[PDB]
Write a protein that binds this ligand. Sequence first.
Ligand SMILES: COC[C@@]1(C)COC[C@@H](COc2ccc(-c3cc(C(N)=O)c(=O)[nH]c3C(F)(F)F)cc2)O1
Length: 453
Amino acid sequence: QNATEIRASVGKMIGGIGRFYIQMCTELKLSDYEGRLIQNSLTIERMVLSAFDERRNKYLEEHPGKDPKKTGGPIYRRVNGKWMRELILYDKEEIRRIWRQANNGDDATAGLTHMMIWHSNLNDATYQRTRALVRTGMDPRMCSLMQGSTLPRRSGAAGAAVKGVGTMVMELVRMIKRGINDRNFWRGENGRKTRIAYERMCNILKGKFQTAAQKAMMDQVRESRNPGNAEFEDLTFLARSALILRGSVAHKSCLPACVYGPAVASGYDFEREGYSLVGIDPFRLLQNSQVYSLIRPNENPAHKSQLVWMACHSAAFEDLRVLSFIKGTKVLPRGKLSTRGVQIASNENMETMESSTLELRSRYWAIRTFSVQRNLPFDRTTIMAAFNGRTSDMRTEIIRMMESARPEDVSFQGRGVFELSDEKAASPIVPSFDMSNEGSYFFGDNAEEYDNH
Ligand SMILES: COC[C@@]1(C)COC[C@@H](COc2ccc(-c3cc(C(N)=O)c(=O)[nH]c3C(F)(F)F)cc2)O1
């Protein structure tokens, strides 16, 4: 009976985001089109994360905003066939009241982390993190292990699950660099809290490893009373190892509020029907949805649609050849998309801006991981980065595992793909892949580096 109870409590969370978005569209007097504008969804999603964040950086990152009791951003309206941008300012107390009213009195912080994860996934598909890796002394080819790297600093347990091996390594390495340059970083009251933060991140990263030797190496890193070069080296060693010996990184398909809003509006009872982020529910919901996006004059709308599709399905870090078989169209690496980002900057010219319908559908659905061996080669930059390296018996054990798994390539995991009509997953399809296609989203990447406006 517990399986249906998880579905009901997740559905209850979804339904509250839906009712909240409907009430917000209503307050703002947004049309059906404006309500389904993904830029409007972002502003409303951020408004409620900002109303509960209270400048702690738990659900959001904002530039310091003007009046602490007020929050807002850009709402876009179609006046006389043209898109206009307006800066709204809503009372944080009032936003919190609408959020709680939408969730039948409950605080529903799971609804907030759900929207925060959606933002993180959209950032993982939009902006590059290569210069950030270089600044921490890390190999920029660790770009494929950067799940949830734009998450806000105080994102708790809900953020930890979706973070990658490289994200945890980058975070822990930044602390070790501060301790190396300044011993006072591990002293006093600040040092006591940083030590507990360090031990927490170590156990979160350790939990992500799936071998005995990698977890045992994380114990050595964690027990180190004064972290220095030897801890940085082990962490980067384990990050290189995570390119072949894949870790346990939770990938959550979190949709925008302008997807949950219309489904709730049409009477879908998410609490009663149940909802699961794993499987058909997000794919089925995107088939029954209609979302729009503001687009720039030189952007391809099929490319803007792919970026949003990848963000919806938390697919930025998946093998492109796998995503192409599931979507039914060829999914291109970020360096081949002629699009620059969903969010409209304050300095952009709205007079040239147009709108387009986002293609968020998929040929097949699939589930998060007598069979036929269906292999996919490791990408060229993955093998060079993973085999870039002082000595230990756990290091030789990890090297032995990395060298024996390497010729085996990446086998597709799970029992095939499913037609959208097959809701019970009883008729799997053979997944074919054109092994000549790149396979990594970040190959030849030219996307803007992540920055807070
Ligand atoms: C480096 O990849 C490692 C391998 C080769 C290991 O074997 C598994 C294989 C790929 O498997 C899948 C990856 C992603 C999905 C999937 C699932 C959901 C979901 N709600 O459940 C979703 O929302 N979206 C997707 C999508 F494809 F779009 F990313 C299904 C299967 O990847």
